[PDB]
């Protein structure tokens, strides 16, 4: 998937985690988000199209995906332990990550 | 790229880091490992091909890549602070994560 | 030190980081927050004093400090690389973790 | 507890996690290790007794406790999900952390 496709996947599944009425729905959405974040690792965003992939600026870009991927990891452990309220509380943590990368690079 | 190709990138760069003398050599190798681990995320390995995509086995397979990505994240911070020997030692911690996933799924 | 004293150190240093101009101010504040979070680890908060020490509530109380310590770890790496604005933004992510634990246990 | 007391606690509970015949024994030992690691945060080791607590060398010392505390966090999520074999596999990850700090600072 390109960056825009992975972003729609993150957006749809974040909404699911906000509306989830059960653990299985949250677990399924977090697994799709993990796959979209991992796949977005390789992308060059438009604002950085004229920087080499080995540049410090691209390092600072990708750093936000480490944070998101880390937060999804924890949210899935919380969802697996039956903590349905907590797992959703993930949504507040993920949103801050979404916003920081968008503010710097979108 | 395919799972065996990402494993060759992980193996080759782990050896670059062992034999490295400076932070720029360690940084470049870890950047390539981060990209290979991220790219291997959605791979299905041969020994799990007849399992459900949401089998506990496929969950546990992907959990290994969360561990590896987390460790590469920390090693690149140490390399970025010019801590060459610490970054090299951190890359040595990766081997436990290599071995745990191989023991179960290779 | 006691839990309220560590909370005053976290609150005061979070504000130092917001108003900071340079990396040394951000580094010193985050070092104090790391020590306060670590010291608060084994505290029992007033609203959980009649629960088992291994109640899910006390497990969930300590999980919050794991999240906070992880975030302070990453913020100090960014401050150590001289990324003043990123470190300050990272300190802003702490507020979600502040709020989640307060919502349940303060 | 002083550093030596927290270290005996880490050592006794690591052995428990190596010998555990059930999840509850592993969970109890990981909780004691988390408390000992958090409490060891504030300590100055003998080899660094003549460095100020705000020094870079003490920062590099404490960094090893972030790694250990992070690894215990994950081991407890794995133990909680009923993964008794995996949870123990933690013991291999923790040992590497033990050894790195000891090699540099003991
Ligand atoms: C960087 C590390 C990012 C993180 C983390 C997240 N997003 Fe993102 N997103 C990013 C970029 C560079 C772009 C622009 C891509 C382009 O080619 O233009 C986006 C775009 C979106 C969009 C599209 C809407 C738009 O206004 O362009 C959406 C809906 C979106 N991103 C959602 C999203 C969510 C929900 C995230 C976290 C859960 C998230 N993104 C993280 C860069 C980054
Ligand atoms: C799972 C989560 C894994 C982690 C972490 C690592 N590896 Fe791996 N590796 C894994 C599998 C399932 C396989 C078999 C792939 C197949 O289709 O047969 C491998 C294989 C390798 C190989 C052999 C490659 C080949 O023959 O073409 C190597 C050299 C290898 N892995 C190295 C490696 C290193 C160095 C790792 C950590 C740094 C590592 N792997 C992690 C699964 C997983
Ligand atoms: C639980 C895991 C917590 C996290 C993370 C944070 N705080 Fe906290 N805080 C917590 C409790 C249980 C309490 C009540 C303590 C009591 O005995 O009443 C508090 C209290 C505070 C306060 C009030 C202190 C006082 O009145 O003396 C402040 C100002 C405060 N907390 C700030 C704070 C900040 C800034 C945090 C993140 C950076 C934060 N807390 C995290 C539990 C937890
Ligand atoms: C630094 C970040 C450390 C980590 C992580 C761990 N240990 Fe440690 N340990 C450390 C120091 C500086 C010392 C010496 C303290 C002193 O005053 O002399 C120790 C000591 C021990 C000992 C005592 C035996 C000895 O040879 O001195 C033991 C048994 C021990 N440590 C065990 C231990 C284990 C099991 C750890 C991980 C699970 C571990 N330590 C981590 C510094 C650090
Ligand atoms: Cl972020
Ligand atoms: Cl592993
Ligand atoms: Cl939290
Ligand atoms: Cl370590
Ligand atoms: Zn793609
Ligand atoms: Zn959609
Ligand atoms: Zn957790
Ligand atoms: Zn680190
Ligand atoms: Zn190490
Ligand atoms: Zn492992
Ligand atoms: Zn980081
Ligand atoms: Zn951020
Ligand atoms: Zn939270
Ligand atoms: Zn003590
Ligand atoms: Zn003993
Ligand atoms: Zn995990």
Distances (CA, A) of A44 to A7, A53, A57, B39, D105: 13, 7, 11, 15, 42
Q: Whole-angstrom Cα distance, residue A44 to residue D81?
A: 37
Asked whether A11 lines ligand 1 (CB < 6 A), one says yes
Is residue C96 within 8 Å of residue A93, measured between CB atoms?
yes
Give ion ligand 6 contacts, CB < 5 A: B 64, 67, 97, 100
C-alpha B75/C-alpha D80 separation (Å) is: 28
The percent of chain C in helix, strand and coil, each rounded to the nearest 5, is: 80, 0, 20
| Domain boundaries, given as residue ranges, for chain C | 1-106
Find tokens 């006794």 and name the residue. D12
Name the experimental technique: X-ray
Print burial letters for D62-86: b (CB count within 10 Å at least 16), e (below 16).
bbbbbbbbbbbbbbbbbbbbebbeb
Taking contacts as CB-CB distances below 8 angstroms, the residues of chain B near C81 are: 77, 80-81
Q: Give resolution, Å, one decimal.
A: 2.0
Q: From the CA of D7, how far away is ligand 7's center (Å)?
A: 28
Q: How far apart are CA A14 and CA A95, in angstroms?
A: 8
Please name the residue that has the structure tokens 């710097």: A104
Q: How many C/D residue pairs have CB atoms within 8 Å?
A: 41
Distance between Cα A100 and ligand 5 center (Å): 5
Residue whose CA is at the smallest distance from ligand 1 atom 37? A98
d(CA D50, CA C46): 39
Calculate how far, in angstroms, residue A57's C-alpha sits from the geometric centre of ligand 5: 15
In terms of phi and psi (left: phi > 0; alpha: psi -120 to 50; beta: otherwise), the region of D82 is left
């Amino acid at each position: 998937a390109d960056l825009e496709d992975n972003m729609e996947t993150l957006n749809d599944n974040l909404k699911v985690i906000e509306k989830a009425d059960n653990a299985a729905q949250v677990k399924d959405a977090l697994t799709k988000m993990a796959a979209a974040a991992a796949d977005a690792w390789s992308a060059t965003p438009p604002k950085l199209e004229d920087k080499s992939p080995d540049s410090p600026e691209m390092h600072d870009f990708r750093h936000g995906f480490w944070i998101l991927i880390g937060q999804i990891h924890d949210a899935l452990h919380l969802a697996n332990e039956g903590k349905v309220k907590d797992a959703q509380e993930a949504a507040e943590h993920l949103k801050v990550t979404c916003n920081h990368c968008h503010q710097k690079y979108r």
